[PDB]
Symmetry: C2
Subunit: 156 residues, 2 copies
């Protein structure tokens, strides 16, 4: 019964991420460990504002933001900012430095599609310290990748 | 918007299964390929009846059944039979040779818990020829396993 802002807040913190990807066509599989740092940003934060106008958007719509940093294979940091839909607290657009949807079950779904490339990710908490996510990648008329991630909260 | 019977019918067929499991506590991971054969059984089928009475159940409740066979590491075959809930076509009990729940999104959820061991699996179709499933295993007060499976329909 939580919304995006709640989901974003919950995600905040340091996590150990274990990723496994299945390459459908080649019946292969590659896995990789990684560290993740999710810090919730306030609508006031300059990073948020920058992204909004960047996407030609008004910061008055940004409900919150987040800075996701990783490390492990490659590494970096990106900022995400959700823009609400007409009178909605569950669906809208997600600005990346794509569309999102919060569901009754408390799981977030992200969808970004260009032309032949469709990407669908689903994130959810199995525990306040266990975030999981699945995803599929469709490309040139065929599914090409299916992935899973286990993220356990670190602490410190 | 499909129900169990529909989900069971859809699952029927031969599939190539790719499984990856993440062992949380030890930050490990093991993957394995496998073949799967799902044949839908009718309430009339003797295998179904046997299981019902076996679970001290009346075959008049069984909406359908299924024989799941696999191969690859270990191998075998088991039968599953869903028993409906009072005036319900989405939730109920699942007899294994545990509780189930069909959702609006068309994804099935299976839950079986003894005492300290909790098991939650979620199956769904990303395509009529792509069935996916995630799961978590809680044991002795701690999550111990998270898994993902990609199943692409074979044919023949």
């Amino acid at each position: 019964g939580m919304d995006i802002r709640d989901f974003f807040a919950q995600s905040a913190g340091r996590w150990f991420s274990q990723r496994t990807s299945h390459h459908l066509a080649f019946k292969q599989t590659e896995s990789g460990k990684s560290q993740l740092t999710i810090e919730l940003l306030s609508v006031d934060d300059p990073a948020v504002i920058a992204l909004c106008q960047q996407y030609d958007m008004d910061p008055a719509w940004a409900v919150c933001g987040a800075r996701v940093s990783w490390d492990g294979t490659h590494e970096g940091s990106t900022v995400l900012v959700p823009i609400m839909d007409q009178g909605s607290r569950m669906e809208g657009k997600l600005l990346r430095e794509g569309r999102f949807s919060m569901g009754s079950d408390g799981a977030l779904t992200l969808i970004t599609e260009y032309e032949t490339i469709y990407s669908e990710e689903r994130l959810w908490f199995a525990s306040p310290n266990l975030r999981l996510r699945t995803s599929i990648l469709k490309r040139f008329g065929g599914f090409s990748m299916a992935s899973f991630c286990s993220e356990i909260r670190l602490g410190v």
